[PDB]
Amino acid sequence: KIDFYVSDGSKFISQDFYPKFSWESTPEYAMFGNGASLLTPKEVEKIAAKTDFICIEKNHAYRTLEFAEIGAREEIKNFKAIKPEIKALYYFNSAYAWPFTSYNKNFKKNKIDDYPELKKFILVDKTTGELQHRNNTLCFDVLNPEFRTWWVKTVAQGVKDSGADGVFIDQMHGFVWLRSSQKEEVEKAMGEMMANLKAAIGTNKILLGNNASSVKDVFPAIDAAMFEHYNNKKLSKENLLKEWGDMLANAKAGKMSIFRIGVEAEKEEASQTLIKGSRGESLEELSKERLEYYQACFLIGAQPYSYFQYGWGWRLDTGPLVDYPELQKPLGAPKGAYKRLHENGWEFTREFEHASVWVDTEKKEAKIEWK
Numbered sequence: 001k002i003d004f005y006v007s008d009g010s011k012f013i014s015q016d017f018y019p020k021f022s023w024e025s026t027p028e029y030a031m032f033g034n035g036a037s038l039l040t041p042k043e044v045e046k047i048a049a050k051t052d053f054i055c056i057e058k059n060h061a062y063r064t065l066e067f068a069e070i071g072a073r074e075e076i077k078n079f080k081a082i083k084p085e086i087k088a089l090y091y092f093n094s095a096y097a098w099p100f101t102s103y104n105k106n107f108k109k110n111k112i113d114d115y116p117e118l119k120k121f122i123l124v125d126k127t128t129g130e131l132q133h134r135n136n137t138l139c140f141d142v143l144n145p146e147f148r149t150w151w152v153k154t155v156a157q158g159v160k161d162s163g164a165d166g167v168f169i170d171q172m173h174g175f176v177w178l179r180s181s182q183k184e185e186v187e188k189a190m191g192e193m194m195a196n197l198k199a200a201i202g203t204n205k206i207l208l209g210n211n212a213s214s215v216k217d218v219f220p221a222i223d224a225a226m227f228e229h230y231n232n233k234k235l236s237k238e239n240l241l242k243e244w245g246d247m248l249a250n251a252k253a254g255k256m257s258i259f260r261i262g263v264e265a266e267k268e269e270a271s272q273t274l275i276k277g278s279r280g281e282s283l284e285e286l287s288k289e290r291l292e293y294y295q296a297c298f299l300i301g302a303q304p305y306s307y308f309q310y311g312w313g314w315r316l317d318t319g320p321l322v323d324y325p326e327l328q329k330p331l332g333a334p335k336g337a338y339k340r341l342h343e344n345g346w347e348f349t350r351e352f353e354h355a356s357v358w359v360d361t362e363k364k365e366a367k368i369e370w371k
Contacts, residue, residue, distance in 0.1 A: 004304050006251045007337035012304040013254055015223070017165070017204035019053035019087040021305050023334070023352070026295060026327045029258050029307035031168070033057030033091075034316040035100075037064055038074050047320045048083045050327070053307055055089035055168045055208075057314050059100040068100040073162040080163075089208060090164040092155045094193070095171035097122065097138045103154040107138050121147035123175060132178065142174040143185060148193040156200045166206025166223070169194070172215045191217025198222070206256075213246045213257070224256035226309075230265055237346045237361035244301035244338065251303035259301070260309035261294040262318070263287045283312040284322060291324055296359035296366035299331075300338045300348045329370050330354040 003023060004012045014021070021027060030051040038061045039047070047054065054075075061071030069090070076088045097107035106115040112131075113119065123132040123139040132139045141147055159167050174186035198207050198221040208224035209215065219225075227243055229235055243259075250257045263286045264271070271282050291310065298308045310327070311319015332353025341347035346362035359366040 001333050001335055003333055006303055007248055012251055020085055023331050025331050027307045029053045029309045030320040031055040031309060032316045032320045033060035035059040035063050037061060043321060044078050048079055052085060053087050058091050058098050062100045067102045069158045069162050076163045087165040090159050090162050090167040092167055093170045095140055097140055109136055139175055142189045152197045152200050155197055168208045170210045172212055187217050194218045194221040213250055225250060226258040226260055229261050240297055240361050247301045247303050247306055257306040258309055259298040262312050263290050264312045287312050291326055292368055293364055293366040296357050296368055299357045300350050300359055
């Protein structure tokens with residue numbers, strides 16, 4: 001059992017441009033943005049002391065540095081100055097035309113008709129002739145080849161401008177539910193756009209596909225994938241079990257996995273009715289109560305170059321600054337694959353050099369015993 005040992009006895013072959021990795025403690029990925037401001041230097045140290053593998057989210061500091069990719073560029077620079085080994089990822093959505101970057105600034109209801117060349121990249125509602133939207137965010141059309149070329153170009157420009165080590169690509173679906181008859185064409189178009197992005201990107205850049213581990217046409221192009229656990233089904237005992245096999249398959253293919261948990265996805269009765277700072281306090285408390293269970297779920301399936309993300313959202317103030325001491329306890333190399341304790345139960349165990357993991361994904365209990 002070596003630091004690169006895959007749970008099935010095979011060996012992980014990292015590429016040279018990948019993030020640092022070790023089993024010393026629970027490996028951590030942090031992903032965050034704050035539309036309001038840049039991180040203070042103290043906050044950069046807090047996050048940089050937690051993670052060597054970070055991603056800046058869709059609107060970071062846009063309200064004070066005008067454009068999200070300028071926010072990202074600022075954090076890339078601040079983190080790498082103090083920790084040159086840190087990898088920092090840009091963010092870009094494949095589907096929702098968030099107007100936070102310079103690249104997307106014209107996808108607004110007051111600017112888009114000044115840019116007919118860009119409007120043509122968007123899905124139109126056939127009955128009304130109006131643009132499809134969600135809270136007035138428009139929808140890219142992956143079936144449109146001029147859009148795919150523009151998008152690849154735009155993503156590469158953002159990575160290059162920001163100096164990031166790669167990009168987190170969010171959304172895989174291609175709004176297929178609005179064009180269900182062309183599901184096959186949507187899926188191939190997505191895979192093709194992702195393949196073209198990987199080729200256009202510098203060959204030392206990490207391409208991370210959110211929820212892409214099982215997206216057959218996209219998998220060949222990505223170096224990394226996130227498991228986002230955005231709903232109840234994703235958190236089901238059956239899907240956690242599936243995901244452990246997916247993490248193995250990612251490892252075998254040379255790819256990184258991010259196992260992200262946000263406790264907001266539980267819809268715990270604890271948060272019902274609450275708003276503002278009060279809702280925040282309840283979600284933080286819930287993250288601290290649930291950490292052992294969710295840490296165990298990751299550890300059961302952990303492979304080399306897999307990382308845990310934790311909190312209760314995607315912001316600077318939903319986890320990265322929060323002290324979770326169990327994520328810093330000594331872990332060590334795993335001692336082989338997990339075990340399903342007995343047939344048709346949902347208890348699983350795994351042992352590491354400095355810890356024993358038990359988790360019941362049916363009754364949502366866990367115990368990590370630290371040595």
